[PDB]
Design a protein around this ligand. Structure first.
Ligand SMILES: Nc1ncnc2c1ncn2[C@@H]1O[C@H](COP(=O)(O)OP(=O)(O)O)[C@@H](O)[C@H]1O
Length: 449
């Protein structure tokens, strides 16, 4: 397979990146087998996680060997392949599984890291210094996930010396099989964005129109712990009722500048969702509750206020399509709020982005900022799983062009259509949390000006 010829020459790093069905795995297994037939090489096949030997490439190597008719040249055991002439040897370990064993390995000439998109930073940091024999090589094959993932950073963005980087897709595969073609064509039609990621190997990256950067979010995680301040203020919760579609319902809650809960609501109708979200608000001790009223949520006001009966909890229907709040007020932090934002959705997503950016500059560049103007994610309270789902949605929120030079964002419907992603309801819920239109004191009425 001609494109791989540079892997035959000596290079410290040989990295093959591409999408599904590119032929990169078959090529590498073939080259490694042919090398083993000729040189007494010790070859480590490594991956992030190996729960059983069947997760490794040993079966692929056996098939290659059998395919080319080399069977009689080899010894084959459960977890090892050895060439009878050269004494070359394949071995197979997971990095996360037994790091200790990997560090102890000696005389390794070639390490193949397969499915390397899964390989974490700490894994590379364990693995790479163990491959220390002079002229030893590290071969890497992976299908890019995110541009910010360590593997993509390490070999594409900030690449080491002496790297042979090949980029391959199914069109570079002369024996691209029908079973994969059908699946590829089907995917190309149903979801073009997913197709380019899976089949053309394009990593997930930030649109140049995105408004919130991932590095801000990472800095913002536990920023209150990093910078040494406590949550102070009212509790605000918000609910995104989603649609009648499959998309999960959203809930977010914060205590002042510290977000404390992010939740998804699955397999609920509209009333179940409202009941779920209002119950969370009560459990979170909310002083203020908002929900998206622009769609299916427009009828939820009665159920919502009833759920709060007897409790001093403000209840506000958020309509993101409306003119911005206080639109005639001068813009801050002759130009009015109305000149700047098309609508409430943009207004409050930018309030969120601004808080996040300010926190990022505080954490990363030591620039002082009032905690009140920042936003921290309480990782422990929220849980890593929900936090990551939220972040994956926030990094996709994007600005679109506007013919009055106003700030405007792609709607949820537009995102779903163009990006092929589920509605970003966790992100919208958090956005609505940024808004506090209802004035209240323990000693007074609730006043909505
Ligand atoms: N040199 C080859 N000879 C015959 N078939 C091949 C060859 N290279 C790839 N293929 C076919 O293409 C398919 C995908 O190749 P593979 O290396 O698994 O791609 P990737 O690892 O990039 O997803 C294989 O399952 C095999 O059927």
């Amino acid at each position: 397979n001609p494109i791989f010829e540079p892997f035959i020459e000596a290079h410290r790093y040989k990295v093959a990146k591409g999408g599904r069905g590119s032929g990169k795995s078959w090529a590498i297994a073939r080259l490694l087998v042919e090398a083993a037939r000729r040189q007494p090489v010790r070859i480590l096949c490594a991956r992030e996680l190996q729960n059983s030997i069947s997760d490794s490439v040993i079966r692929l190597l056996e098939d290659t060997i059998e395919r080319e008719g080399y069977s009689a040249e080899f010894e084959i055991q459960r977890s090892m392949i050895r060439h009878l002439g050269t004494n070359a040897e394949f071995m197979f370990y997971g990095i996360k599984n037994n790091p200790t064993k990997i560090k102890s390995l000696e005389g390794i000439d070639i390490c193949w890291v397969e499915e390397a998109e899964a390989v974490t930073k700490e894994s590379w940091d364990i693995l790479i210094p163990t491959i220390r024999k002079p002229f030893s090589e590290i071969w890497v094959s992976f299908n890019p996930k995110n541009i910010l993932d360590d593997t993509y950073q390490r070999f594409v963005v900030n690449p080491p010396d002496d790297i042979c980087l090949l980029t391959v897709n199914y069109t570079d595969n002369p024996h691209f099989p029908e079973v994969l073609r059908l699946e590829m064509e089907e995917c190309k039609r149903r979801n073009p964005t997913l197709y380019r990621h899976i089949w053309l190997g394009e990593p997930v990256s930030a649109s140049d129109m995105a408004i919130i950067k991932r590095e801000w979010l990472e800095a913002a995680t536990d920023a209150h712990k990093k910078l040494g301040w406590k949550a102070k203020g009212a509790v605000v919760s918000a609910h995104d009722p989603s649609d009648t579609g499959p998309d999960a319902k959203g809930y977010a809650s914060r205590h002042g500048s510290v977000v404390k809960r992010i939740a998804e609501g699955l397999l609920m109708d509209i009333n179940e969702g409202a009941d779920w979200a209002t119950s969370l608000a009560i459990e979170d001790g909310a002083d203020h509750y908002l929900w998206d009223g622009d769609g299916v949520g427009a009828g939820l006001r009665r159920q919502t206020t009833e759920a709060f009966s007897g409790k001093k909890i403000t209840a506000t229907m958020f309509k993101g399509s409306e003119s911005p709040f206080d639109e005639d007020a001068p813009y801050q932090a002759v130009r009015t709020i109305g000149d700047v934002f098309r609508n409430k959705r943009a207004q409050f997503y930018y309030a969120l982005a601004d808080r996040l950016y300010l926190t990022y500059r505080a954490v990363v560049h030591g620039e002082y900022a009032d905690p009140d103007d920042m936003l921290s994610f309480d990782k422990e309270a929220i849980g890593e799983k929900m936090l990551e789902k939220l972040f994956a949605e926030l990094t996709q929120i994007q600005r679109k062009f506007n013919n009055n030079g106003k700030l405007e964002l792609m709607t949820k419907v537009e995102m779903k259509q163009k990006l092929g992603i589920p509605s970003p309801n966790l992100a919208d819920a958090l956005m609505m949390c940024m808004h506090c239109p209802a004035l209240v004191r323990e000693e007074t009425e609730i006043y909505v000006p």
